[model samples]
Target: WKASVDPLGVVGSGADVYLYFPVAGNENLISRIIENHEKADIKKIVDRTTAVYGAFFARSKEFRLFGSGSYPYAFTNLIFSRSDGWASTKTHGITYYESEHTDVSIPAPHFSCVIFGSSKRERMSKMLSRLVNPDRPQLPPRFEKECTSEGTSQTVALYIKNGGHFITKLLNFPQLNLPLGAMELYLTARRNEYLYTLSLQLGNAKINFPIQFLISRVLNAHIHVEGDRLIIEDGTISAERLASVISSLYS
Candidate 1:
């Protein structure tokens, strides 16, 4: 999901929201083609070091800006996309703390990704509220840099002081050190469309819905509180099932 100042509406499809519409005979199967095209590029960097880093998704595309500050600090921005396209894109980010260069005033170019999906302005407001709340546990520091600047050169650095948010963690992928605390998976769907589903892996624990699980991610995997059963999808939730479906395929 990239950020955007003004987004365009769907073309001629009557589909206000986008979904994974596979071609005939290719239902439920996506190519991940574009993402694969860059795999070699990623492997080139990873081959040099044992540890892999974060990857940026849309550097080639010039994105538009929605926020403000200086001139050199901002360049271009991308309009945030829902899970409409055929494949999942990723940004590979490396955790660089100390570098050979000094505090170089590099451009502080940042992109916005529209996460919580809803057309309503109020819904977007609420979703952003949850995203930026300082009290939210495990969330990253709020974005404080001025993105609207066009000329003020932004500084570059190896270490990010307060950059451990959801986007950063996913790309950087620092060590967990301990067993998985809360595992979140993202699923998506347009309003009035079939909600997409992704399998999750949970060890043998008394699987409780709503409490044991909350839809921390996006799309069809929305956290819901039912009468007694906390539910995301209609069915049983188990670690074995999720692991088998999603991870096993990766292997």
Candidate 2:
């Protein structure tokens, strides 16, 4: 998940929420895509990623997906079709496509992309500033800097900054004090079951969630706390459902 502010990596700075999916070994995600996408279209979206990390900026309420591949321009257009005479704007050596609900930009050269939705041009520019500007860095206060040293070579992972304040709100549940600190939750998708764990560096605190809350928000999950890590096993949650939960958090 290359947790630092990287203009080239999947996650740039100023992201209140980060979600990553490395294509390999994540069958649940692929299966979910297959349900609604054409076979060729699925290949276009899935095969290009060593990892795809998307982010949400709370300041502008804009969501950005960074999964640029070999064909950066083609990938951008594939996400949103344009008319024959439609043109992208060029300003200051940066080309961007903007409409009422979509935008696109490329902040760096690491097979990176900046296609967005329902965002104004200023929101896009704001994110670009967050990416390249160190004078006003935007990573969350108290975010795990140790996470910057970690990598996402697995199925799925997530990092939420200051989750304690908003997680209960997103889940539509009470804050029963389940160690809702900054969470680096990881998920491993297997054919038989899904395995996940929340890594909190809070010194072996017990983290738990009720089964009722689990079923409502994210389908069935078996949660266990071992030290500061919350182990979530036996996951029957499909990828689409998980995606829904993520969008709802911002929606």
In terms of lDDT, which candidate is strongest? 2
Clashing pairs in 2: 1-152, 101-118
Worst 10 residues of 2 by lDDT: 140-149
TM-score between candidate 1 and the true structure:
0.19
C-alpha lDDT values of all predictions: 0.22, 0.52
- How well does candidate 2 match the true structure in TM-score terms? 0.60
Those runs of model 1 whose alpha carbons end farther than 4 Å from true positions after fitting are: 1-22, 25-32, 35-194, 207-213, 216-231, 234-251
Best by TM-score: 2
- Summed backbone clashes in each candidate are 36, 2
Backbone clash tally for model 1? 36
Native-vs-model 2 lDDT?
Answer: 0.52
Residue-by-residue lDDT tens digits, candidate 1, 36-119: 222232222222221111111121211111112222222221111123221222222211111111000112233122221112
Q: Positional deviation of 223 in candidate 2, in angstroms? A: 5.4
